[PDB]
Write a protein that binds this ligand. Structure first.
Ligand SMILES: CC(=O)N[C@@H]1[C@@H](O)[C@H](O)[C@@H](CO)O[C@H]1O
Ligand SMILES: *[C@@H]1O[C@H](CO)[C@@H](O)[C@H](O)[C@H]1NC(C)=O
Lengths: 125, 40, 194, 49, 49, 48, 49
């Protein structure tokens, strides 16, 4: 019961990053309902599908520098490189905004030299 | 009729690990489940 | 349960198995504890030669140090102990000319041969109900170990759990399991500032 | 004979883990049984017999 | 079942343990089949009786 | 919770050597009832 | 190799006996498994285990 008391204190009244505690899948909400001599919890969740193979390289090279992302990852179709989040594909063009820099790009492994649009220069043109 | 068999755990599947391979979804999907628990 | 922890990171507990190279993976399990992605890619080997030296140190423990697998034994000992305790009581007359039946019949006539036996019973059933009530409880407890574990594999193994002192000591990165006779033994890898 | 053996056959081992154990119970034995009834001062009429 | 049997699909591990630099062998299975168990496992079964 | 520990031969019998000479054949219940009480005293400490 | 009801020198029981490599002592009569149950028998008329 207590366990069933925790859910209506964790899963129903809120969201919990825990797995298999508020149902199968990345929890989103939990609508409860009754029983004769028990409780029931209806867990709504997030089930990914329609996958797609991509190719990765964690960091990128430019000006000899190494830039990393902020939230999401780096992928590439065959020729282009894009940045997107880890649980949905909605790709974007790389920028000096959606990344950041630390170090020289001779140490990270798996790197792939690329280019960077930067949204300031033409604003100077 | 009847049968007696060893237990199947599931479908043997293999993944394409690689130092340059990821996988990301494109469409989501919702599920609804039931965790029945007693109280009384 | 491990073929996807390494491979599929932790995407094998929310649906289909999405892969990842275990470098981009730790690169995320650091983004939970509050470490920027650089601290892994730029210090990988030092992180590597640590993980690999981290196990051998465990080898000795479970390969050289006894007393490290206690609880799983304190369970075996009891269940088997009380058992012999049940085997043994069968030689405690519980109030009769013996603890052996065929004799008691082969020495008397029914009337007392029936009460003699009517006592022997009155302790055995008492012997059994005792063992039982010592076998329910010890079978209830072991449950709390399981509904717990089931809640540890569900969190520590299939993913990251921010809960301090749940997947062990430190901001937890990733917990790897291995099995056992009647239970499990987890290998919780963590982060420790120095 | 010696108490390190007062245990051994309790546990039934010829070896004793580090750690403690419990074997028996202490209880003093009594002596000098006593009886002290009340002042015997209400007697029967025998001299009158 | 509630503990070890969460998943429904049984996965495996490729031969190419180019897993970023680590050596997970001490946990992965042993194709030599000392009962298809692992190293840090087998000890746990022989180190217990 | 408070740890209790008992001396069965003291309770059931109360220092009547006659009695204990009967419990030997009522078996080994005497011990167990203690073992299950120690196995508590060990844990209700561990808990703390 | 048969379920039987037997008496060995007054010792009566039921079960299945088998040839056994066990080595009694020239005087010993019958061994008892844990629980002190009857374990085996050296057969008198040939004194064999
Ligand atoms: C009732 C009565 O007088 N009983 C007498 C007592 O007085 C006397 O002291 C005693 C010794 O001769 O013998 C008796
Ligand atoms: C990736 O793995 C392949 C082996 O399949 C190896 O030849 C190559 O050098 C590796 N490179 C990186 C960047 O991981």
């Amino acid at each position: 019961a207590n366990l069933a008391a925790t859910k209506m204190s964790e899963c129903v009244l809120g969201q919990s990053k825990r797995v298999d505690f508020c149902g199968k899948g990345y929890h989103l909400m939990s609508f409860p309902q009754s029983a004769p001599h028990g409780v029931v919890f209806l867990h709504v969740t997030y089930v990914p599908a329609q996958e797609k193979n991509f190719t990765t390289a964690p960091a990128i090279c430019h000006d000899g520098k190494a830039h990393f992302p902020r939230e999401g990852v780096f992928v590439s179709n065959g020729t282009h490189w894009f940045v997107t989040q880890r649980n949905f594909y909605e790709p974007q063009i790389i920028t000096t905004d959606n990344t950041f820099v630390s170090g020289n790009c001779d140490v990270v492994i798996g790197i792939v030299n690329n280019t960077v649009y930067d949204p300031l220069q033409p604003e100077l043109d | 009729s009847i049968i007696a068999y060893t237990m199947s755990l599931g479908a043997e599947n293999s993944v394409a690990y690689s130092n340059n391979s990821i996988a990301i979804p494109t469409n989501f999907t919702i599920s609804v489940t039931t965790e029945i628990l007693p109280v009384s | 349960l491990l073929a996807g922890t390494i491979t599929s990171g932790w995407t094998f507990g929310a649906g289909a198995a999405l892969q990842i190279p275990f470098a981009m993976q730790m690169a995320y399990r650091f983004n939970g504890i509050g470490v920027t992605q650089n601290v892994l890619y730029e210090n990988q080997k030092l992180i590597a030669n640590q993980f690999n030296s981290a196990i051998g140190k465990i080898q000795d423990s479970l390969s050289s140090t006894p007393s490290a697998l206690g609880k799983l034994q304190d369970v075996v000992n009891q269940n088997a102990q009380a058992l012999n305790t049940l085997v043994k009581q069968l030689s405690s007359n519980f109030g009769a000319i013996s603890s052996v039946l065929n004799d008691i019949l082969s020495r008397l006539d029914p009337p007392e041969a029936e009460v003699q036996i009517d006592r022997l019973i009155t302790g055995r059933l008492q012997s059994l109900q005792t063992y039982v009530t010592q076998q329910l409880i010890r079978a209830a407890e072991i449950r709390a170990s399981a509904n717990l574990a089931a809640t540890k594999m569900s969190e520590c193994v299939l993913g990251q759990s921010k809960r301090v002192d749940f997947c062990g000591k430190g901001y937890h990165l990733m917990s790897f399991p291995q099995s056992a006779p009647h239970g499990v033994v987890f290998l919780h890898v963590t982060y420790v500032p120095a | 004979l010696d108490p390190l053996s007062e245990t051994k056959c309790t546990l039934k081992s010829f070896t004793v883990e580090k750690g403690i154990y419990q074997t028996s119970n202490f209880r003093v034995q009594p002596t000098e049984s006593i009886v002290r009834f009340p002042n015997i001062t209400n007697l029967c009429p025998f001299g009158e017999v | 079942q509630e503990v070890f049997a969460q998943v429904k699909q049984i996965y495996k591990t490729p031969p190419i343990k180019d897993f970023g630099g680590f050596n997970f062998s001490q946990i992965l299975p042993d194709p030599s089949k000392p009962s298809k168990r692992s190293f840090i496992e087998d000890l746990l079964f022989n180190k217990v009786t | 919770m408070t740890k209790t520990s008992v001396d069965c031969t003291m309770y059931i019998c109360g220092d009547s050597t006659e009695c204990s000479n009967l419990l030997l054949q009522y078996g080994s219940f005497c011990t167990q009832l203690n073992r299950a009480l120690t196995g508590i005293a060990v844990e209700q400490d561990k808990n703390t | 190799n048969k379920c039987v009801n037997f008496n060995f020198n007054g010792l009566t029981g039921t079960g299945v006996l088998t040839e056994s490599n066990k080595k009694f002592l020239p005087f010993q009569q019958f061994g008892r498994d844990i629980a002190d149950t009857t374990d085996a028998v050296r057969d008198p008329q040939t004194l064999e285990i």
